[PDB]
Amino acid sequence: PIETVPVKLKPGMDGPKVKQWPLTEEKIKALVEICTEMEKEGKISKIGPENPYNTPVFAIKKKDSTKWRKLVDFRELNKRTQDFWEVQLGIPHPAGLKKKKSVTVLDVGDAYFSVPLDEDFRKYTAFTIPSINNETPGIRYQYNVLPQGWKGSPAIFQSSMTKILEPFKKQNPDIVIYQYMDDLYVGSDLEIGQHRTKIEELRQHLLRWGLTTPGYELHPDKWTVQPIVLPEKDSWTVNDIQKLVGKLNWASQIYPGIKVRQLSKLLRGTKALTEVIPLTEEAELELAENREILKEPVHGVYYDPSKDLIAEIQKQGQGQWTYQIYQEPFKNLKTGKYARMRGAHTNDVKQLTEAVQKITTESIVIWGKTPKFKLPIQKETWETWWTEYWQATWIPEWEFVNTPPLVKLWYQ
Amino acid sequence: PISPIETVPVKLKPGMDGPKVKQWPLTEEKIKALVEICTEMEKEGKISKIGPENPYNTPVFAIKKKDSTKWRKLVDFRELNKRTQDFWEVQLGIPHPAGLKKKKSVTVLDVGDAYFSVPLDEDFRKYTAFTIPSINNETPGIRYQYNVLPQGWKGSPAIFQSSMTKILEPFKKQNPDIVIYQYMDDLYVGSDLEIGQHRTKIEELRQHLLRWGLTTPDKKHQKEPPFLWMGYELHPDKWTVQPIVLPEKDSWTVNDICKLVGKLNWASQIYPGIKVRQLSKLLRGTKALTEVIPLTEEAELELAENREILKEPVHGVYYDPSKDLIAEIQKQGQGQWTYQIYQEPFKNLKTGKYARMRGAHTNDVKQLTEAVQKITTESIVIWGKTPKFKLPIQKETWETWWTEYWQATWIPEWEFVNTPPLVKLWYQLEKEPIVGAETFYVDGAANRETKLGKAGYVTNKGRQKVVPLTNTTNQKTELQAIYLALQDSGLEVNIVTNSQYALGIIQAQPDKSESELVNQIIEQLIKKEKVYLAWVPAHKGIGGNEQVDKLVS
RNA sequence: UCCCUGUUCGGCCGCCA
């Protein structure tokens, strides 16, 4: 019997209507189940053809569960409420949570199961459950409470949340807490043993206000960056210096201090490619002073909260991936690398979904945004297999690029 | 009386009102039939007369079938449909006969007056207002508005399948061991009861449906497979597509090929191995539908062999959820593939085709992975699992590809088959520069205006070449400079280009390309022994690449 | 100007009610 905060769509934008893609029968019987008991509890109620709105839904298995999780694809419903959850009831960002020597993740989705939902807005959050070979027409539901995975649910509930957390924030004044969609990030400078206790503390302190937690430990200080590496060689061949001058000249777009003039004199004839050449001293100097300017971060590159985050991934072979997070071209806000993760040297898509997920956390922690993804894969390959290896509770917005390695710059 | 089954609330588009358009002229032969039907629908209750308080009106006419007395009523709902709300179709596709599990008793039942048995929502019944005259000019005429879902509205199909889901919905909880698939106005009821007890539950369902206003005549064909349904023949233990009649023309028009290709393309889902690449290669740049076009020797070679696959009738089996799915691919050359899904060998479930030359420049490993991604979804749809894959590419060829390709590529669990032609990689760019081979520093340039341009090379030995080009591009002159270097080189060669475009194309080991020029480069790469290709950036005064650009400007 | 990608709307033939 709680009063309902009203929700309305952004000016002049219709609700989401996204087609529901086919599903493996193993995620059908489970989503047929998760909705039987959510309807028996009243969390959702069946609808009919008068609703022209639909949002995708599928099933993930969180890491080592054997108990399925229901996950809905709210990206098109999300980007259509944006003035509600950005300009109005937003969530501020704890600039220092990234400094913490340790950070734990906890799934607070059960708490959205209670608080009721505005009656105008439950027509835009309807999802269909498919059946195999188009037998039963799709068993279309809709959401009577604050749904899981929406970006308006942590904006409405943040009040009832601050009160539930208010005893524990006064009890530990150093600890830093940030809340993103269905997830909660708790951060302290305590040591991993004393740290694992404090979460169990917040686990029951929230369990007594009705939150049931279905550990995930981050270490934002230990995080490394990816160096723009030039080769170090005893002997250079005509071929080696063209590859090098190509990297520096491809590099001159970020670090404006690089120079290629004196190493190009080194290539003054129309020579064979494997011929070894002596580096002049003006070129040993050009080579060194370049190896320096790369030791420094890019200049004047600072996060701009109005701009979207962009993340590009490059597949460097042998189970290693490179990536860059940016907002404007050649102004890199972060770089990284991933190696021999799960699915190492056995599966690439398993590897990328691991790559995409581990990148989304790094950005939510440092900027409170889900970076937009440029995926190096064809579209039907990602759709068909991603949710098998997807374990997160959010879903970032992505596009697929067909880019060859004109320069395989990032490692070599 | 008011309606037996629950109504379905409808609304207009925001800020829009009903349709107002006056009727066409129509001959006295058709007009006489409609006034009879309107009182036959009025007597049965599908319509009601109304005064002039209803400003909305929408046209009507009729069409008569050949060799048949029956008429089709029609409503020009164009303006009502423009302003009727969006619906979310509850029909995400059409079920396919290979997906039917095996059951003892299969009964096909047909709803009579299917859309005419659902109640149009009382609030909306106003916009369904139409006018019909007795004679073409004399009678002023009467106005009537709808009491049911009308043939020809934009929600009449989306609503019927939603209400009729509420109707079959308890019956399914009453008989879990009997399954009812529902498409449109036909119903397929199947069980593992005997042929006698299947006639008892058929009357049980006939009557449970009668409880809601649905009439299933006994005039229907009984349990006598082959049931004709969707253009197929569904037999007791097998199924096949309805036999195919090919136009036997001594002269072919474009209407002849377009109608023929669709028949061949429909044949492929059970008849294995049909090809259509060259019969459609004739229909590419065609403008007139009736104008004749000749069949080249290839396209004529394509018509004869296909005609021979269809001589014998073929059939597939059904899905048996305890046996696994094993899907097998064969190459057809010229970028065409055919495949069969089965469970017990030589008992094919279905067959199929994938031929999309996708991308401008594709090889046999990209194309084999594209056929896999389409068999995988066509199997997730029909049987809801990923089949096991028999694939004619060596376990080592595929191991070299995905490790080296720059896009992440995966294939589910698969095994090798040695049914030649095996699919393999036709060459390999070296990773370190060849010693002792002439190094060709190539570049090309053209003028967008004049479409004239040059392509050429300067090497280490001093050799040069520039070739003028006519009606060409800047991209197409760079792809040509590299072709000059491959002709004019030995079996071992180096090439330095500043073309990101060309270096991208080549590096993807592509053996079949749509541009006849790219196929020139593939053949010279196949004939070399060691090719090494590298990129330098342009206008950085690198070696002779700074120079040869001057010769090509 | 150039290429590929993706999305989103349109013309005719064949099939269904």
Next chain:
RNA sequence: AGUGGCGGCCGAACAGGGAC
């Protein structure tokens, strides 16, 4: 001279990223 759907063909705008 209606609508929806399925197969075939042809294009039309919109947006993406790269190549000059």
